[PDB]
Amino acid sequence: LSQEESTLIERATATINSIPISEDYSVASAALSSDGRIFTGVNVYHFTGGPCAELVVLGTAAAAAAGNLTCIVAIGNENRGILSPCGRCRQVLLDLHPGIKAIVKDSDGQPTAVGIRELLPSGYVW
Amino acid sequence: SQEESTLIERATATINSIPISEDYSVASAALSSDGRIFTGVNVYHFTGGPCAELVVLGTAAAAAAGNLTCIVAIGNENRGILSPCGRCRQVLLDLHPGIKAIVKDSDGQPTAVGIRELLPSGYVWE
Amino acid sequence: LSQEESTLIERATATINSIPISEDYSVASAALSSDGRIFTGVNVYHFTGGPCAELVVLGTAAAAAAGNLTCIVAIGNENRGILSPCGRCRQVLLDLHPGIKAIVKDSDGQPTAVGIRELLPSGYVW
Amino acid sequence: SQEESTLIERATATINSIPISEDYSVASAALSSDGRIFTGVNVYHFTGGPCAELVVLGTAAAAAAGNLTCIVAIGNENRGILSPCGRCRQVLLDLHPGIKAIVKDSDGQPTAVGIRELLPSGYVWE
Ligand SMILES: CN(CC[C@H](N)CC(=O)N[C@H]1C=C[C@H](N2C=C[C@@](N)(O)NC2=O)O[C@@H]1C(=O)O)C(=N)N
Ligand SMILES: CN(CC[C@H](N)CC(=O)N[C@H]1C=C[C@H](N2C=C[C@@](N)(O)NC2=O)O[C@@H]1C(=O)O)C(=N)N
Ligand SMILES: CN(CC[C@H](N)CC(=O)N[C@H]1C=C[C@H](N2C=C[C@@](N)(O)NC2=O)O[C@@H]1C(=O)O)C(=N)N
Ligand SMILES: CN(CC[C@H](N)CC(=O)N[C@H]1C=C[C@H](N2C=C[C@@](N)(O)NC2=O)O[C@@H]1C(=O)O)C(=N)N
Ligand SMILES: [As]
Ligand SMILES: [As]
Ligand SMILES: [As]
Ligand SMILES: [As]
Ligand SMILES: [Zn+2]
Ligand SMILES: [Zn+2]
Ligand SMILES: [Zn+2]
Ligand SMILES: [Zn+2]
Numbered sequence: 001l002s003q004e005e006s007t008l009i010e011r012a013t014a015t016i017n018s019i020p021i022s023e024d025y026s027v028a029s030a031a032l033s034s035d036g037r038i039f040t041g042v043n044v045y046h047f048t049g050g051p052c053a054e055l056v057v058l059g060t061a062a063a064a065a066a067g068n069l070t071c072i073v074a075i076g077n078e079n080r081g082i083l084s085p086c087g088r089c090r091q092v093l094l095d096l097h098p099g100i101k102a103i104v105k106d107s108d109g110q111p112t113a114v115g116i117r118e119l120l121p122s123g124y125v126w
Numbered sequence: 127s128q129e130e131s132t133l134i135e136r137a138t139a140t141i142n143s144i145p146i147s148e149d150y151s152v153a154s155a156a157l158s159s160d161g162r163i164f165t166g167v168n169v170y171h172f173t174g175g176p177c178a179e180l181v182v183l184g185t186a187a188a189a190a191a192g193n194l195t196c197i198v199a200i201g202n203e204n205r206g207i208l209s210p211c212g213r214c215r216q217v218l219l220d221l222h223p224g225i226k227a228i229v230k231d232s233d234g235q236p237t238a239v240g241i242r243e244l245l246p247s248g249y250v251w252e
Numbered sequence: 253l254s255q256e257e258s259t260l261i262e263r264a265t266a267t268i269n270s271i272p273i274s275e276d277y278s279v280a281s282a283a284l285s286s287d288g289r290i291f292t293g294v295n296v297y298h299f300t301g302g303p304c305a306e307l308v309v310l311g312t313a314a315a316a317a318a319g320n321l322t323c324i325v326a327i328g329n330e331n332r333g334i335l336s337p338c339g340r341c342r343q344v345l346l347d348l349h350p351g352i353k354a355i356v357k358d359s360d361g362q363p364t365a366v367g368i369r370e371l372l373p374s375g376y377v378w
Numbered sequence: 379s380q381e382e383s384t385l386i387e388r389a390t391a392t393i394n395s396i397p398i399s400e401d402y403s404v405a406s407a408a409l410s411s412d413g414r415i416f417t418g419v420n421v422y423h424f425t426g427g428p429c430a431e432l433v434v435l436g437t438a439a440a441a442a443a444g445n446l447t448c449i450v451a452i453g454n455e456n457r458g459i460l461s462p463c464g465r466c467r468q469v470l471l472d473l474h475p476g477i478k479a480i481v482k483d484s485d486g487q488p489t490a491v492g493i494r495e496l497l498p499s500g501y502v503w504e
Contacts, residue, residue, distance in 0.1 A: 015188055024221060025187035042188040044180055046217045047251060048465040049301045049426020051176040051184060055169055059181030062150040063140055063167040086376040087346070088425040091339025092171045096149060104374050114374075121371060122356050124338040126172065173340040174301020174426045211501045212468025213300040219464070229499045244498060247481045247491070249463045267440055276473060277439035294440040296432055298469045299503060303428040303436060307421055311433030314402040315392055315419040344423045348401060378424065 004071070005103060005111055008032055009082065012053075012075040015040045027083060029053035031072035031100075033061060039069075054089045058096065071113060073103035082111060090120045129157055129196065130228060130238060134207070137178075137200040140165050152208060154178035156197035156225075158186060164194075179214045183221065196238060198228035207236055215245045256323070257355060257363055260284055261334065264305075264327040267292045279335060281305035283324035283352075285313060291321075306341045310348065323365060325355035334363060342372045381409055381448065382480060382490060386459070389430075389452040392417050404460060406430035408449035408477075410438060416446075431466045435473065448490060450480035459488055467497045 008030045016028035019042065027043045031054075041056030051059075053074050061069055072093070074083045084104045085093065093100055093116050101113040117123065133155045140153035144167065152168045156179075166181030176184075178199050186194055197218070199208045209229045210218065218225055219241045226238045242248065260282045268280035271294065279295045283306075293308030303311075305326050313321055324345070326335045336356045337345065345352055345368050353365040369375065385407045392405035396419065404420045408431075418433030428436075430451050438446055449470070451460045461481045462470065470477055471493045478490045494500065 019187065019190045022187075025184070028188065040188055041181075041184045044176075044184045044187065044217065044221070045424065046220065047422065047424070047427070048213050048216055048429075048463060049174040050217060050424070051169075051180050052425075053184070055176050056166075056181055056184030056188070059150075059166045059169045059176055059178065060185055062144065062147075062169065063153065063165055063181070065144040084374050084376045086339075086378075086425060087343025087372055088173050088340035090372075091173055092169065092175060094339070095171065096169070119373060120339055120342075121373070122336050122366075124336045126338075170299065172297065172299070172302070173304075173338060175299070177300075209499045209501045211300060211503075212463075212471070212497055213465035215467075215497075216464025239499070245464055245467075246496060246498070247461045249461045251463075271439065271442045274439075277436070280440065292440055293433075293436045296428075296436045296439065296469065296473070298472065300465050300468055301426040302469060303421075303432050305436070307428050308418075308433055308436030308440070311402075311418045311421045311428055311430065312437055314396065314399075314421065315405065315417055315433070317396040340425050343425055344421065344427060347423065348421070 004032060005113060008071060008073050009111060011038055011040055012073050016075050016077050021077060026077045027053040027074055029057045029072060029074040031057045031061060031069045033066040034068040034070055037066060039066060052086055052089050054085055055092060069097045069100050071101045090116060094120055094123055095126050130236060133157055133196060133198045134236060136163055136165060137198055141200050141202050146202060151202045152178040152199050154182045154197060154199040156182045156186060156194045158191040159193045159195055162191060164191060177211055177214050179210055180217060194222045194225050196226045215241060219245050219248055220251050256284060257365060260323060260325050261363060263290055263292055264325050268294065268327050268329050273329060278329045279305040279326055281309045281324060281326040283309045283313060283321045285318040286320040286322055289318060291318060304338055304341050306337055307344060321349045321352050323353045342368060346372055346375055347378050382488060385409055385448060385450045386488060388415055388417060389450055393452050393454050398454060403454045404430040404451050406434045406449060406451040408434045408438060408446045410443040411445045411447055414443060416443060429463055429466050431462055432469060446474045446477050448478045467493060471497050471500055472503050
């Protein structure tokens with residue numbers, strides 16, 4: 001319902017729907033920075049651990065000296081909507097942006113922002 | 127080459143435009159067949175945070191860049207050109223088989239080398 | 253308190269304490285199979301995503317046609333005790349062994365077996 | 379060579395001793411300086427599940443094998459020898475710089491090749 005939430009979802013959705021359907025690049029992500037910017041990116045699939053969209057976003061933000069990221073979401077291609085961050089993404093997000101929130105779907109399938117720590121209970125502290 | 131220098135210059139500007147960091151310490155820049163340039167910075171993590179080159183691949187994909195023809199990585203602390211790691215070579219060989227990577231030759235001078243030459247008898251993923 | 257729990261912890265602990273102190277190999281893991289076997293392994297640290305001990309254990313079990321794994325634990329070197337599985341390990345465990353439990357420490361720092369799904373709420377379904 | 383054939387034979391027996399699987403489809407066997415042989419099977423996962431070779435590295439480390447001198451990977455479906463992937467070459471070059479890998483030559487016959495030759499102008503991690 002949030003304007004910030006709807007906008008992030010919109011940017012990620014528009015990003016994935018603007019590229020050709022691909023099995024290598026099938027998810028887009030968008031994150032909001034505390035200094036007033038939004039960074040996007042798409043995943044790179046590879047058996048050796050190609051980065052999820054969220055990790056591409058982290059590198060894109062870093063390249064712009066974005067600093068602290070407060071919220072991030074991932075949207076799947078072919079109108080799949082919000083995709084929950086995988087376990088590796090949660091670990092990287094927790095270690096590099098502990099104050100970040102991730103948008104996921106609740107029981108009713110409605111968008112909801114959750115603290116990263118809640119997505120990774122008793123998380124490993126690197 | 128003009129295109130070569132262009133990527134080196136862009137990646138160098140990128141890493142020199144962000145705070146010194148152990149998490150974000152390398153920048154990369156790639157050239158697409160259409161002539162566009164894409165950049166990115168690595169995201170270090172023990173679970174396999176993406177190298178700058180992989181962030182670049184995802185950034186280009188988010189822009190529907192298509193095929194990439196050349197890519198280089200520049201390290202912080204004035205280290206200069208860094209040869210692509212083994213994982214990067216595999217991902218590049220699988221997603222952009224015709225791409226070339228810039229590395230330092232015997233005399234420490236930059237040069238463009240085909241991906242296949244950097245991964246002889248390479249494993250071809252199906 | 254469980255005998256099965258104490259034994260897994262013991263096997264993992266004995267495994268890590270039997271090798272030279274290393275920054276590359278610093279954690280051991282042990283998992284129980286439904287067919288009556290216990291598999292161990294140590295991590296392999298690498299920036300490209302060297303496998304955590306638990307992933308080495310998964311490959312070791314697979315090599316023995318172990319089948320279904322029911323419980324797994326990780327023990328750090330230098331008497332660090334039980335280490336919670338990282339986010340990537342949780343994702344791999346969920347996708348390859350959905351019925352498995354992981355031993356982690358509770359508020360009182362006491363060993364406790366938890367369902368993998370509880371360690372990865374609203375988990376991404378590959 | 380006798381040692382060569384030994385690794386090939388061991389890895390072949392390993393992959394042929396487990397159920398056909400898309401998650402566990404390659405076996406690897408390595409030789410240590412002391413003469414011991416270590417095996418393992420890959421663990422496929424998009425977040426970067428370990429290749430069989432990395433599982434082998436962790437298995438050897440759990441036995442305090444020390445330095446590894448040679449390693450090979452054998453694929454299921456009677457595919458035979460598989461060249462080590464780019465990520466594997468990087469990890470091998472960083473943790474076992476003097477190791478050699480068995481690959482198929484021009485005539486498709488097995489041969490031992492130094493890791494450095496498989497990763498020319500390789501990135502050296504610090
Ligand atoms: C044959 N092949 C493989 C196809 C394979 N089915 C692709 C696949 O499953 N990709 C997925 C891998 C990562 C990605 N993903 C998942 C969770 C996330 N929210 O953290 N962020 C993210 O980017 O989601 C993709 C997704 O749902 O299409 C090739 N690409 N060649
Ligand atoms: C303590 N710590 C770790 C510090 C560690 N020394 C960082 C490090 O070595 N990072 C490296 C990881 C990836 C990156 N790299 C390497 C090869 C490449 N050309 O493919 N592309 C690429 O981006 O190069 C970085 C580099 O040389 O500083 C933390 N960040 N917390
Ligand atoms: C300089 N350097 C890096 C040193 C670095 N500090 C090592 C490090 O942090 N390793 C960690 C990486 C993975 C491992 N780990 C974590 C969570 C797990 N339960 O899922 N399973 C697992 O094996 O835990 C190790 C641990 O706690 O020592 C080198 N190795 N060269
Ligand atoms: C649908 N799916 C994916 C199926 C996929 N085709 C599996 C696949 O290609 N796996 C490969 C991933 C790693 C492995 N591999 C590659 C190079 C190596 N020499 O370094 N060592 C190694 O173990 O080789 C396997 C291989 O050739 O079957 C699932 N498992 N769910
Ligand atoms: As939000
Ligand atoms: As070039
Ligand atoms: As248990
Ligand atoms: As050999
Ligand atoms: Zn992810
Ligand atoms: Zn790399
Ligand atoms: Zn892990
Ligand atoms: Zn590999």
